[PDB]
Design an enzyme around this catalytic site. Structure first.
Site, PDB file in Angstrom:
ATOM      1  N   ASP A  14       5.054   6.445   3.905  1.00  0.00           N
ATOM      2  CA  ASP A  14       3.942   7.242   3.139  1.00  0.00           C
ATOM      3  C   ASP A  14       3.902   6.551   1.907  1.00  0.00           C
ATOM      4  O   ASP A  14       4.871   6.129   1.484  1.00  0.00           O
ATOM      5  CB  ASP A  14       4.142   8.782   3.196  1.00  0.00           C
ATOM      6  CG  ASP A  14       3.087   9.504   3.047  1.00  0.00           C
ATOM      7  OD1 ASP A  14       2.977  10.533   2.340  1.00  0.00           O
ATOM      8  OD2 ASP A  14       1.975   9.258   3.584  1.00  0.00           O
ATOM      9  N   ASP A  52       5.430   3.665   8.670  1.00  0.00           N
ATOM     10  CA  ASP A  52       5.490   3.186   7.426  1.00  0.00           C
ATOM     11  C   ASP A  52       5.912   3.963   6.049  1.00  0.00           C
ATOM     12  O   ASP A  52       6.172   5.314   6.591  1.00  0.00           O
ATOM     13  CB  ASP A  52       3.997   2.700   7.100  1.00  0.00           C
ATOM     14  CG  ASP A  52       4.027   1.333   6.077  1.00  0.00           C
ATOM     15  OD1 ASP A  52       2.928   1.343   5.185  1.00  0.00           O
ATOM     16  OD2 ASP A  52       5.030   0.521   6.207  1.00  0.00           O
TER      17      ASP A  52
END
Lengths: 287, 287, 287
Positions: A214, A212
């Site tokens: 951050d 993902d």
């Protein structure tokens, strides 16, 4: 003896593929305690590979408590000369997207509470971590990724991995700060793994799976019901294809690594000055 | 009692010079265990100096395991008011070259796993480290270097020392990151030494010996057969000349240091509120 | 059972105000040992509030040794859903002056030696700290400050708090470095407090009391006889007024916090896979 030139460190079932034959387990004791889990050995087209589930079965360990020293020592006793570490990472950069992979060439160790050397208590050594991830193994991973013909995402090389203590994810301010230090991806596990592998004279490189953005990117997404299952699933399956390709290249090419002689000019305490307890503890690391 | 106003912390044989007379050893026990090695005492033109081999004889300790608290406590029991810490450092800057010396005025503590205070467990104090290295002692070191007429290199002042945990050398990314934080030199030992010395009310300053470019400069050089022997040798011998000059100046000049009263406005727990175990442990530090 | 929806963490005598009725003490044992001191409970206009003296009575603990896990666990057993943490901070910014208050929205954890999770040893969870300080509680604190009509200073919001290990104050180089990371205020206590409170599913926000310019501003002032007494005194008294106002708003408004369900999508080890010792240790944290 049971023996492997190559090892993979990652999630379980990296090894769970029909291509991997005569799947077997070995319990290795080390002067540092037990590894995270029994090491699985098997063959990929006749080549023996060790698989080590970093977080233990059922993902039972936090990054902070992984027994890094026992893990690396155990791999060294199998005669491993090359390690591919596979790990989930957050992106700090817009062009690094979920389902991409990243082969970093640099690392910044921000972990705090991990024992990060085999040395101390009777022996002193200072290995160079200037290039902390073997560029020969990183170059193989790039070609292995292409060879794997992965359907989603792309692979990026020459990136900087910041390793944090965890177990919580970063505040937005810390994420902003890592970006300003020019880091590209963030994880929790490849330090002190890379430092120990260097001390152990084993070539080590990372295959990072972007899972993902951050929090530098406000989303609350790719962590959903119809998502982080498929996300993590797909990363895991894609990762297995790349590893198959990487093993075949490492086996046929056998690149020389600077990691292979990292200990010899780094050791300050000559072996003949070590106590018996020290030499014993360090036995698999020494010449 | 055996007594010294001045101490040097560095490698062994900093004290191994014919100029240093009535060389003698003292075993000092402290509430923190033993110092790294017996403290050597002797006279430089009638002035008594304590020499403490930070890493023990034969360089047996890694930076992470040096008993910093025992070392500083032991020096305080000898009545030491001034410490010159001598240490090997990597350069982060093109103009700081191997065989140069550096007298930093600032420090950044990046160490992780070192006990870095005498306080806790029954007493609270918060000393100021705004100026972590005594400018009076740093000014003496500059004049001492000139007085020593050293043949190779130059001496640089007003530099920032970043202290890292070790024992491995930095990755290139970390070296780049220290440069962006404006650090100039990198070592592994002067923290928590400087914090403890401040708590102990002892004036403390560093003489740094540049031994190579930290990896921000790709070389694999000045770490060779015909080199790091002569390199380290020459640094060591030059360092001894500077220390001789510094001792004579500290002895005749006796500069007042702000470190000398650092404890008095920093102590939160009044002595009369401490337990007996606490007062005993802290005895040499208190008024 | 003794029960409180709201808790204040700060210095003693935050609770020492006639407005706070039926002042009483409770000794709470936790799987982590005892909290810093007995929690004081009382009512502010019928609303029950828990006050916890972070550093113990007589300020007996350094930041590094505060039992953060026992403190947060104990508050969770009282059913606390909201925490206001009150703490003294140094300013890194010209416009943040002594006697000002600051309601940060971000934090950077630079502490080193603190246990900063409840997880490990049989359970794995990764909470998000993207927004580490509950914006609903931070918005209440802003309105509470205005409502308190404080005579000196102003209150600033949307600031970044850097938490350092201590116990010493920063070198000038570290202060410069925190400024370059865009931090605004510096303290020693709100990490790991904020991480633990998040794991505990309790909404948590900080009221920071500026007590001096961190050393980025050379002064040796507001730490004097006629000063840091009045300084700290006035901050303390002003802080009490703000807390009174904040409690009344939290009680009538009861804002939903994302912290309230932070555990539910973060927990990796299902409860049914935990050992009995683990489930017991974590009991108050679990659903």
């Amino acid at each position: 003896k049971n023996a492997a030139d190559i090892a993979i460190i990652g999630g379980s079932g990296l090894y769970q593929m029909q291509a991997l034959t005569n799947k077997r387990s070995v319990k290795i004791e080390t002067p540092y305690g037990e590894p995270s889990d029994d090491i699985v050995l098997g063959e990929l087209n006749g080549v023996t590979v060790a698989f080590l589930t970093r977080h233990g079965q059922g993902h039972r360990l936090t990054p902070s408590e992984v027994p890094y020293r026992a893990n690396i020592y155990a791999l060294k006793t199998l005669g491993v000369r090359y390690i591919v570490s596979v790990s989930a990472v957050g992106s700090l950069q817009e062009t690094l997207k979920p389902l991409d992979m990243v082969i970093p060439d640099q690392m910044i160790d921000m972990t705090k509470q991990r024992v990060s050397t085999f040395f101390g208590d009777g022996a002193v050594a200072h290995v160079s971590m200037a290039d902390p991830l073997c560029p020969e193994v990183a170059d193989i991973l790039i070609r292995a990724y292409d060879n794997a013909d992965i359907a989603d995402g792309q692979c990026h090389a020459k990136a900087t991995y910041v390793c944090i203590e965890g177990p919580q994810f970063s505040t937005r301010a810390e994420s902003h700060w890592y970006r300003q230090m020019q880091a590209d991806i963030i994880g929790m596990t490849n330090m002190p793994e890379a430092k120990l592998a260097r001390e152990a004279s084993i070539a080590y490189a990372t295959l990072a799976l972007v899972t993902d953005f951050d929090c530098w990117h406000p989303n609350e997404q790719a962590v959903s019901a119809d998502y982080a299952i498929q996300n993590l699933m797909k990363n895991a399956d894609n990762a297995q294809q790349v590893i198959k390709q990487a093993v075949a290249l490492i086996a046929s090419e056998q690149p020389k690594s600077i990691a292979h002689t990292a200990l010899t000019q780094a050791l300050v305490t000559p072996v003949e000055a070590m106590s018996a307890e020290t030499k014993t503890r360090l036995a698999a690391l020494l010449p």
